[PDB]
Symmetry: D2
Subunit: 322 residues, 4 copies
């Protein structure tokens, strides 16, 4: 068995066809444009392989066995490490001037980054909302990616099964509501001296944000608008994991929720470096840099609710005692 | 024209075949081992594409027109930026455990990184000391390496002519002078030998005979002229050039060094040969790195008069 | 010596956990402090390069071309430092939101707006005060150090005083400006007769034509200048293009490198701003966070002008051939 | 309470005194040499802070309460992330040339990196084989070190109990030499290995059964510790490369610090040379891993 055939280099190293050269005008730099894209595409392929396997571990019910938690977390972690490398690859393409790009730009229409299947599958499989062309079996794979359970949904189901939520067990939700309410009364009774009412106003801010956690109708309204993604119950699971992270059963789960936020951030870091590049090369649906600039928002953060949990931080003493 | 077709994705994204799976025991991590390789190989091809283009500009006489020096330097820079990323790219494969590698290791046999054609071309084309692919490989040994092209170009540096600036004559004079000026006998007597030893062609012509040096003597003087008068406008960009060349060398060693760590993390203690590639033995531009041990006080540097610009 | 040379008796006695001095030591506060100290140590150094580069422009002896190697290589060093500053945020990412919240209270009134060095850094590069987005909605001899910094010459101002004097712009010399507008007309007229031989590139042509010729609109330039969009004088804009188009010309090689650095700085600063705000979001949720997302706009890019050059890329065979 | 006060910047940003002004002529590039050094020393301090508190959780015995494993692994990992930055950090000082260095090198002598307290503190607390700086050096030579603490912990690893799970046992060609306990203690007597015989099998158990819930975060601690070792080496190698970029060849000793002899956690490294087919690993029964 030969290194070359094992790696299928007869394919990989035979895939660089310069359009400029095909049209009787080799432009040196077009070869960088191709290589850079094909390397990202191999890594998208690998992200999909990691990400699909973790999806099966939840689909399966195999996550129901903690033994498998180390597999899920270190493949999530592996996605991050790849995504990080992806962000740093931009540095290679910055060694291309706009003037070198402008010599070959024309040979490129009407191709677009939107024709990237794997990028779309990736967004879909993670759980990018969809309300926010392709043919044949590519179009199949895409519909499978829009219809199969997403990593977001699979995680939401696992969150919804967190130990601690049982109102006849630990009763987390119920005591958290009770301790926050007692907490605030304490803070109100204290605050009674009189130009520090900065403190009264800062109190009234704290109270609105903390007691809003307990407003399920609010959350539903927010879900149907798209501004939150996890079901209310999922949210109670994720807070339980955050608040009781040191407990052994919650340690590796807490790492997972941390990875999920890493992947999201890093997806954003990607998008933001794509937008800076576009701006370097070209200046200023699609408008068309303006559509991209648009994708750098929280609207593309699949794990938005995990980030926002940090808004419902409380003094340590108010956390129900386990 | 479609993204996927333009990038020949029907080849790139159809090249992953898990030997373990083919052999009826699919192991998850093998896919990472293939992709990582395949991505290193893409960039080797890029590095080779930049290198050959640069090689050609020397071989071509195009370097003689200073208009071209920016294309040389910016391409060389680019190779170094790739290599930097190639170095960072090991961190992906470190997410694979010895224990996991072990599960598909056996299916790899007897394949070897020695059978990477491109890595080997790379070394040859820079300069470092099987079917039809032999054609490419033999070609890359016969043909002028980057070391040689840079050497030719160094030999022709402005400022060495004995009836022009006479740089080497003036350097020697200033050096034997500075020395007897102040003149712990062991501090002086053992900074003497290395300094004036810059002028004994003989230790030079000798060291070139046991691989210790690579550039020729005139090549040396050129490099030093550039080193010393780097600020004079016509030396600006060529100084950058020598910097990139050194950068290429370092980072090539960095790659070799991290591959060595990988091997150790997977296989423990082939391996012992790889460690020896982390040597100066594999530094194509040793002579340029050592053009720092010949730092002198700025007073001893021969003064520019109304030269050329 | 090593110790005293580095003033380590000072560097390594600057760590005071405000939490601990309230009898409630929070392990993580110490990381929060060290991380800032290292950023500020590197601001001091960006300021040393930047000020020295500022000085080579001021000392007159920039138009002695022998110094360009200095200007350019210290600018590149600014760049490598900020690259490291961007990677440095990953250290502080290992601190969780829960743990930040066990020390955060001991921090008020302190605010990071009170980084002298960061305000100095923005100012010497040339971000302007009328350019700033107000927080909500608005010192000492530190005001006197800062006070100079906005009134003195900004790196932008000083680079612009170098671009004005770019060779090839004398109307009786090479006349780059003149020759450029004349050649575009003819490429455009030639192209117009090409298309006339749906598509629906009649639309595409007209958009190309308006964009290109508005470069020669000195009026429309000063409209956008006096507003805030553009930052360089029409004549500085003119020499920068010279350098872009003729950059292979020996005397323009290193200057084009200059122009590349200045763009890297603004890119790298924005990247810094953007990581600092990613960091606010994970510690604080989703307000200071609003204003920060505001600084990551192009309003804060001091060399927005050079980036904009890319829209006024023309076909190669239209750049005035030079004898 | 104010930013600069809180950060003690009047002290931090007033340590920059270059021996170029105070001897003749301000050479610009010395400023970088000092700030790089100062930044490494700040991170060294931070590394000492995390590394000390991890030590303390082991001495305390707080480690036996598994609640705290997250805090241990997470702080070891932060050490890693810090070390990775300190490796990327050399990239700043490679923007100074040999030539500009030589112009101020004269005036540094005879300061030495051998004189860095924190470096030697950090090397000793991890457990790598003078003014009252030496009261702090001495404790660090005698205070129980992260390698020992971990060894202590490794001794108590479940599934070792000679009548319990009795992991040592076995099959049925470099693997039988794991079982020569004299041969092993003779390596340790020379110091080509560092953990005690029992501590050795704590680790192989954690290795071989890493999936088992109570072993997961411990498998991360071991992985983390290897990492800190690789990162320290890689720092040494980059530090050696600097030296050669500046002073050229003919230094010979620093090469020798880039060896295995300076891997504190060599045992961990080679405990993944012991690699058997999955079919051979001993099976599992009633599990005391919650
Ligand atoms: C010269 C460098 C590049 C330029 C000027 C550039 C330009 C653009 C532009 C203008 C768009 C907007 C969509 C459109 O109008 O077609 C876009 C989208 C895209 N580009 Fe690039 N691009 C570059 C490099 C890359 C690279 C290296 C990748 C990596 C695979 C990439 C992947 C994409 C993807 C996936 C999209 C669609 C993304 C989305 O939905 O947000 N591009 N690109
Ligand atoms: C999975 C971890 C890896 C292990 C255990 C490993 C192991 C080895 C070993 C033992 C050798 C030398 C002897 C031989 O080939 O039989 C070698 C050589 C080589 N490997 Fe790897 N390797 C790994 C990953 C990589 C990667 C990612 C690349 C990137 C292309 C690579 C490229 C090479 C090359 C080019 C050679 C020949 C290099 C030379 O002559 O210095 N290997 N590998
Ligand atoms: C725990 C991590 C951090 C948090 C939560 C944080 C928080 C904030 C917030 C909320 C602001 C907005 C203004 C305000 O309300 O005070 C701000 C501004 C600032 N922060 Fe941070 N910060 C963090 C880390 C850093 C770091 C590591 C630095 C590095 C020196 C830094 C330097 C600054 C500076 C200079 C500003 C002013 C920036 C501007 O005016 O746009 N911060 N910070
Ligand atoms: C121009 C760059 C530098 C050069 C030429 C250099 C040179 C050296 C040399 C020659 C030695 C060994 C002999 C001796 O100290 O007399 C050494 C040791 C050392 N240097 Fe540096 N150094 C540089 C930068 C740095 C930096 C940035 C640090 C980080 C704090 C540093 C920290 C050390 C330490 C901690 C040691 C002793 C540790 C050991 O035995 O491995 N040096 N240096
Ligand atoms: O032709 C473009 C392109 C072409 C190809 Cl093949 C891949 C791309 N990734 N991102 C952009 C892109 C580059 C110019 C802007 C429109 C799309
Ligand atoms: O089979 C090995 C190998 C196989 C292949 Cl396909 C590529 C490789 N790069 N580096 C090593 C290497 C990996 C295990 C050690 C023997 C060589
Ligand atoms: O107290 C804050 C702060 C305090 C200090 Cl000391 C440094 C800071 N950098 N960025 C923010 C920041 C941190 C939380 C929000 C208000 C400002
Ligand atoms: O003065 C020297 C030095 C001085 C100082 Cl201050 C810090 C150093 N780190 N590494 C080396 C070193 C630099 C040259 C080699 C001897 C020590
Ligand atoms: N893995 C188990 C238990 C579980 C669910 N969610 C969790 C969250 C944290 C800890 C454990 C769990 C399950 O799938 O039902
Ligand atoms: N470019 C000219 C002059 C030259 C040769 N070597 C150089 C080195 C540095 C500067 C110029 C040169 C040539 O190739 O003959
Ligand atoms: N925490 C317990 C049990 C223990 C020791 N080492 C371990 C390794 C893995 C799992 C548990 C342990 C103790 O320190 O005695």
């Amino acid at each position: 068995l030969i290194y070359g055939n094992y790696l299928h280099l007869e394919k990989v190293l035979n895939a660089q066809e310069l359009q400029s050269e095909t049209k009787g005008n080799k432009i040196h730099d077009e070869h960088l444009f191709i290589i850079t894209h094909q390397a990202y595409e191999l890594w998208f392929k690998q992200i999909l392989w990691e990400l699909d396997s973790v999806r099966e571990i939840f689909q399966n019910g195999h996550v129901r066995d903690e033994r498998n938690m180390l597999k899920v977390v270190s493949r999530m972690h592996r996605v991050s490490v790849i995504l990080k490398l992806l962000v740093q690859q931009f540095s290679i393409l910055e060694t291309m001037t706009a003037l070198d790009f402008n010599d070959f730009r024309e040979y490129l229409s009407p191709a677009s980054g939107f024709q990237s299947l794997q990028f779309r599958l990736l967004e879909n499989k993670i759980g990018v909302l969809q309300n926010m062309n392709f043919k044949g079996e590519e179009n199949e794979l895409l519909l499978k990616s829009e219809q199969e359970k997403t990593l977001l949904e699979l995680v939401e189901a696992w969150l919804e099964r967190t130990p601690g939520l049982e109102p006849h067990g630990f009763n987390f939700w119920g005591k958290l509501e009770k301790n926050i309410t007692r907490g605030l009364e304490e803070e109100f009774i204290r605050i009674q001296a009189e130009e520090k009412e900065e403190q009264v106003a800062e109190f009234q801010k704290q109270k609105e944000v903390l007691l809003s956690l307990f407003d399920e109708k609010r959350h539903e309204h927010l879900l149907s608008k798209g501004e939150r993604r996890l079901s209310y119950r999922a949210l109670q699971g994720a807070l339980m994991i955050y608040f009781y992270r040191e407990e052994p059963r919650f340690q590796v789960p807490f790492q997972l929720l941390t990875s999920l936020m890493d992947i999201d951030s890093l997806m954003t870091k990607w998008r933001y470096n794509h937008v800076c590049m576009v701006h370097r090369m070209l200046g200023s649906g699609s408008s068309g840099y303006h559509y991209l600039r648009s994708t750098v928002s929280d609207r593309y953060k699949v794990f938005v609710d995990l980030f926002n949990l940090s808004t419902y931080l409380i003094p340590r003493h108010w956390i129900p005692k386990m």
